[PDB]
Amino acid sequence: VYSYTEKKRIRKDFGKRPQVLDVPYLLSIQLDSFQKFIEQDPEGQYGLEAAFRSVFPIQSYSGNSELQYVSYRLGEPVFDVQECQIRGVTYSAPLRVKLRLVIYEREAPEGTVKDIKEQEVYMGEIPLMTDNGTFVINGTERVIVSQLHRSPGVFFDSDKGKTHSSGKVLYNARIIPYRGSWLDFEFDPKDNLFVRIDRRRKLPATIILRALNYTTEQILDLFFEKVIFEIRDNKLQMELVPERLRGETASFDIEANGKVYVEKGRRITARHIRQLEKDDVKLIEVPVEYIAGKVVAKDYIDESTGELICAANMELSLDLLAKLSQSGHKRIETLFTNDLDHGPYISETLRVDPTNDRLSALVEIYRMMRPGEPPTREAAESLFENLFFSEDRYDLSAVGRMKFNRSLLREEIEGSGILSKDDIIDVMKKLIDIRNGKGEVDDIDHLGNRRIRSVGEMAENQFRVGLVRVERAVKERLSLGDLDTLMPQDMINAKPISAAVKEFFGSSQLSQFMDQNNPLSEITHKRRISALGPGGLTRERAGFEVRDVHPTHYGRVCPIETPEGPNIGLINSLSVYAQTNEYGFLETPYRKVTDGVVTDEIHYLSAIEEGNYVIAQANSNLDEEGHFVEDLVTCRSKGESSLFSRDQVDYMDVSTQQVVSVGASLIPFLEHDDANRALMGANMQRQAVPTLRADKPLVGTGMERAVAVDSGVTAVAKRGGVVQYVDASRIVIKVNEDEMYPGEAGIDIYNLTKYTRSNQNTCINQMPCVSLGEPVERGDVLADGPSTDLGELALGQNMRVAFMPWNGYNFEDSILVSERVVQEDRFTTIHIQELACVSRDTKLGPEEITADIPNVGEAALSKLDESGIVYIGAEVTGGDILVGKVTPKGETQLTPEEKLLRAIFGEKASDVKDSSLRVPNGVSGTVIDVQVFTRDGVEKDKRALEIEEMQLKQAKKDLSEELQILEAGLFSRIRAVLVAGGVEAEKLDKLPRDRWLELGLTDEEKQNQLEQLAEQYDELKHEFEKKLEAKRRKITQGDDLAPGVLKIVKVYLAVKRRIQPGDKMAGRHGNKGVISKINPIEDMPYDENGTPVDIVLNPLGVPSRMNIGQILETHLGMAAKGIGDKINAMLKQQQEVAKLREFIQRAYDLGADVRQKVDLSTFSDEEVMRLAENLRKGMPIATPVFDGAKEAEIKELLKLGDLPTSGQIRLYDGRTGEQFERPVTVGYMYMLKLNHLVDDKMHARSTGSYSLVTQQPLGGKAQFGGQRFGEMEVWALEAYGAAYTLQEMLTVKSDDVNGRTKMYKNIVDGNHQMEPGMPESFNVLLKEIRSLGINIELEDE
């Protein structure tokens, strides 16, 4: 039982495991983050509002003024997404802020206040966002990628053997802010405890204990328990608490309480404490091996004589022990020297430190930022304390204070975004204690310790700094004015926070052009996870911390949805089901136990909790009147794995695709592929492009309907009802009183895109999927887009595939395609691209634009406006004009024996340079839009003023339909309220509305329900009373183009980039390669059906690719498409309606190992038949990745294709009628054509552009350049001994103007020879060397 639009389309899952949750709308790290950056939140600590709440009220340091605040705002837009391409200006609107001022009694003592003033002011701009989760910035969808960074606070790592005079093994503690300056704590090479304040040069770690204000025995009371000795009746003894054995380098042997405890060699590292606490020990007796090397902590004396024995900070010795044996005063306080037990590094570095007090421990820090400059007393304190407590220079958020307290095992759920001058003691304790195993490293790449920084967080981090670095003239001049008579505004500049926040989405370190190759690519782009920028590193200044994998990726971040090459792992994607808590820690869905079984009481849990509860793996299985057929439940934790009994479990995974991101989640057999080709599969589906006759993945996962809606590329019934109009750009519906809101007309609208540019110059368009009078439910599909088939995804097309080598072309994932593909105009792609021109501010003001280029290429001119511009709808190719930027030439010399021809005898008209904008040599396809723009006081040019009436026609018509569509709902509600008792109301739905006022209904309140609706009507339609002009003067709008430009012009091209060789293709399972010949339908193998095969791809390569999902998609596609081919034949003869039902139902009904069923007996014998059209493409299939339709199910379903259930068939050759020495792999694969496009990249050159800087060629397609014969390319000619071919590149084909201008013409000499003159790039260098100051010249031989 399936919906009303599903009567056209239903997908067949095969999966096996107990999901009770499905796809969430994939875009949240854009969407919810954009909201919380720009939300009026009353008590939160994030976004624009929290940035202002961290700086304002600015109660001035001058004590005479205050710039107060109330809240942000956004409002007052003018551009919209259409103008944000057609014009191009970033889709943005002004940030404005509520500000105030207050002043007090200057003169009296009984009123306390005297003045109060408050307003709004401007404070910047903000880009704007679509329902589709996109943004539009300089003509293009430039979009922020989210970051995955070390969580702010502190970290604790271990440089366990780096380098230098002892390969130095280390442990550390290191500050990492959300915003700010720095501090590290570690050890020097010699092994003193050391520090790097702001990570500058070496300082002894006692300095900061003086700065934070602790004297020597306070440092002991903060970091050291204190060892105790005695001497009793006949022996030496020590005195204890039952944890004081934690590090001892035990050369020695001990008993305590009543058994042996320590023995010769067994170093008592803190692991050992679990020998002692259980045993209540408070006294021990030891060899002298633990009664020296223990530094006495006070002075001691001898009443046997009247004398001393030793002083504080002194050792013990056999003679001192002999005097202690006499003493009377038989006690000693002593220090821990055992390493990590307490770290003696403090005690000893307290005597390897020149600093003495807090002033020295701040003055020496001033030197560490200002060598050779006087340490200005008060600024020596500020320079250090403002590293951690400044208005501009430190923050953590509540998130980073939480991580700080968490990595220190605190209980304070209370604290500050700043540090404190005593929090630092615990950072130092952890370093003193860690360094051989009281603990270990802070679990860095745990995905609840590394943290997400979403789009709105990445914008927030700028406002946490810009408000405390740039406001200078405001912060200055606020001190000076008598603000009883001046205002909370009077010095605020407005230029910078426009561009600096508009283009934070268009030129920022994470805000690239979105991957608009096709819908799947933009859907995953919106949830990309960068490891880069402030919080990570780059591609270059980075190791494997930015590229590899750590097991907490499970359920959260798929390790294969990354670019390839050196870019590996630097940017990733969020798995389908994954999200984050209020700390940006990553989380996942789970099933959960009640009374004895893993119930359907589903939950979500953090990466940290995956390290704290027993999660069963997706393997496990339920039972009859019992519990589990899974006797030995396989389980998992932190990303690791185990085996347990039933009596031991808390949770389980909900699905397998919870471990998988969008591109990877469409690979139906990852059960059978290596990661190196799964990586390719996660990118080839993204490089794929819109095609003229698109067709669906027949094999599939289920994501083939989610990814059709996860960016709105298909329109969907957000309310639903009955379809009421349908048009190639427009759709409307009507609704009923079960939903219809308290005064509406009962309507929705679902209009559709048409032709514009994109970020990889792909085409954009949409088309309907419903018709007049169809009822549709709240989730039915209403339209299609650039990569769909009538209600599901189509990133490509299906083709028949032979997995065999052919006559040479297909060696290395390279692809043969049939002539039949060109006949059907298939894998032809469609593109929309833009080209432009200018007229500069001259001394008058304008510049010329026309078509005059006489006797230079006349046919490439025939296609133009009066203004020198092509027409919308005209075809253009290879060299046609687009915008008439002609330029006259000159030659001028013209003396009585130099007037050789023109200026007397012929062509006595212009010599205009071929400088007008033209179609590039290789481009072909229709002009689709044309524009002209100017400084606004000039109302717009004739070619834009005709296009005003081209755009006005659409709205002038549509609003004349809309007004009728609107009142045909609204007055139909009034008509219905009348029909409820005044049943004769069809005498009224045939009148002017004013004449309904001669009426009445019944002696009951329906009468007054009619009255109040008739009163309300004249207010309601004021909605319509604007509409047409609200598009018009966005076209006739002007914009300034900066001083230097009066006007700008554009043309757009629909480039029909056809199927051709050298272009690139792929399939879902990581097969990727060039189209390497087009083959006649018989120049190809044919099946046991007596029928040829559309594509051929080499299997000899496959064992080096280590992947087999490509074979399984091909074989399951042979069943899936074979169902549709058999339907095309069966629909003709029909045989019996129960025979149409036999095959069409059996295609769905055939299964044996499955959670789902398209049970077509739960659908009627015409729902069976409306579905048959979209089944002629083939049967659509589903399979959660790792839950899938394995080989045995393919070998069952193939009894619908009815071809050999081996998947390996007696192929023939169309040219010869032969049949090969063995059966061969065949089927039908889902395949793709990819935006590498050789079509765009035909770049050769005879001669062209030259770099004035060096007389050498320029380089670039965007420069028509010459290309680099590199140093390695020289090594080949050197190695060959090929000196003339090498010298050719070095002068007569490059910078030597003399050489290249003679060699070009040396064909006219007939003697095609070299005639070089001087390598100008060496002539350049001979004067650059002299411009540095080095003299250089020549000799002769």
Partner: protein, 418 residues
């Protein structure tokens, strides 16, 4: 910054530099190009040869002026093509596969005009370049001096630099699937549509009963050139195939037939060309390398070699092996807990058993992959050397290995951590 680091004149503008009369595009396989040749789109030939056109119209009258000629040259009009045969018919184009860490990344050829926007590339040099057909590219350079063209034919030509500079096997060589064709023509079978049988005539693949695996036998008189230039004549009975016999058309018959009496995978085929280079002469060795190319393409397809779900056989007796290795581990993980191992030796004492499990299954795997036709002869049990394609992809040397086969026919085994 004009000198010291990477961007300086020395490396950015001198020892390498941007260059005219040049271009780049995506590589495409060109199996009808002869070894001295390369394919180039007509409008790319037009672009690369403009100095021959805007440079000869004014030298034949074939346009009224170089200004008017805009209407004719960009048009690709008839008069362009005399002007270009006057180049093409004896002109060495240079080709390039940067980054050129080794000599054979740059070579010289001869134009052939084509359709499209690609660069078409002769299959035997695709190996010498390491050409990688994922929409990566190659580059083109036109030599224009008479001297550069003289030295390009003499010094850079593919036919004239065939061998490895490190030792002297060919790398301008019968390439990726070409050598499965040659291996297929030189493999033989039981039943074989010809368990022993012979014929000439390709048209007899259309007489009803033939195979390139059918087991020919023939006396062939055969010859071997001495260092002095005479011919050491020989004669022998043979045990051979139709494809091994067809290769006596292609073989330079001054070396003896008996060299073909084997299975010519990548393991072996280079050494025939190497032996020709050691003994006969340059032209004979070039023709023997070139003509083997189309010989591969006529028959590589007709092998029907594949990868597919029953090209992936598995040893049944893996069942018995799991009753050893997983059971050895099962007591050893108790011996740790009962006090007879620590946690550490126990890691080795189980990883070594996982290695021994993989290597046990890898023995059974080879019997099933290569011979297990058991049913008990007479009238049964063709226990022959297998025709499994994944095995043939390794014994041809086409692209397979034991490390691929383990993952595809028995056990994927073990891995490294980061």
């Amino acid at each position: 910054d004009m000198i010291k680091g990477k961007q300086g004149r020395f490396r950015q503008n001198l020892l390498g530099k941007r260059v005219d009369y040049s271009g780049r595009s995506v590589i495409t396989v060109g199996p009808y190009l002869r070894l001295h040749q390369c394919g180039l789109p007509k409008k790319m030939a037009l672009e690369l040869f403009k100095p021959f056109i805007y440079g000869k119209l004014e030298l034949r009258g074939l346009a009224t002026t170089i200004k008017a000629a805009k209407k004719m040259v960009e048009r690709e009009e008839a008069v362009v093509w005399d002007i270009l045969d006057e180049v093409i018919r004896e002109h060495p184009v240079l080709l390039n596969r940067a980054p050129t860490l080794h000599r054979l990344g740059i070579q010289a050829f001869e134009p052939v005009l084509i359709e499209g926007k690609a660069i078409q590339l002769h299959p035997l040099v695709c190996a010498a370049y390491n050409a990688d057909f994922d929409g990566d590219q190659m580059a083109v350079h036109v030599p224009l001096t008479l001297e550069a063209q003289l030295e390009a034919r003499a010094l850079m030509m593919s036919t004239n630099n065939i061998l490895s500079p490190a030792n002297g096997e060919p790398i301008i060589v019968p390439s990726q699937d070409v050598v499965l064709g040659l291996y297929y023509m030189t493999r033989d079978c039981v039943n074989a549509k010809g368990m022993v049988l012979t014929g000439p005539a390709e048209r007899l693949y259309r007489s009803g009963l033939a195979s390139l695996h059918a087991r020919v036998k023939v006396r062939i008189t055969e010859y071997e050139k001495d260092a002095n230039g005479e011919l050491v004549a020989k004669t022998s009975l043979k045990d051979t195939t139709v494809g091994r016999a067809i290769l006596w058309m292609i073989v330079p018959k001054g070396l003896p037939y008996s060299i073909v009496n084997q299975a010519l995978g990548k393991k072996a085929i280079s050494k025939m060309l190497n032996t020709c280079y050691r003994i006969l002469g340059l032209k004979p060795t070039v023709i023997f390398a070139d003509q083997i190319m189309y010989t591969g393409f006529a028959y590589a397809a007709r092998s029907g070699a594949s990868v597919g779900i029953d090209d992936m056989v598995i040893p049944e007796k893996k069942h018995e092996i799991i009753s050893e290795a997983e059971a050895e581990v099962a007591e050893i993980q108790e011996q740790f807990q009962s006090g007879l191992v620590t946690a550490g030796e126990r890691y080795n004492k189980v990883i070594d058993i996982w290695a021994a499990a993989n290597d046990r299954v890898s023995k059974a795997m080879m019997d099933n992959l290569q011979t297990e036709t058991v049913i008990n002869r007479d009238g049964q049990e063709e226990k022959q050397v297998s025709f499994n394609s994944i095995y043939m992809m390794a014994d041809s040397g086409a692209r397979g290995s034991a490390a691929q086969i383990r993952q595809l026919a028995g056990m994927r085994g073990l891995m490294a951590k980061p």
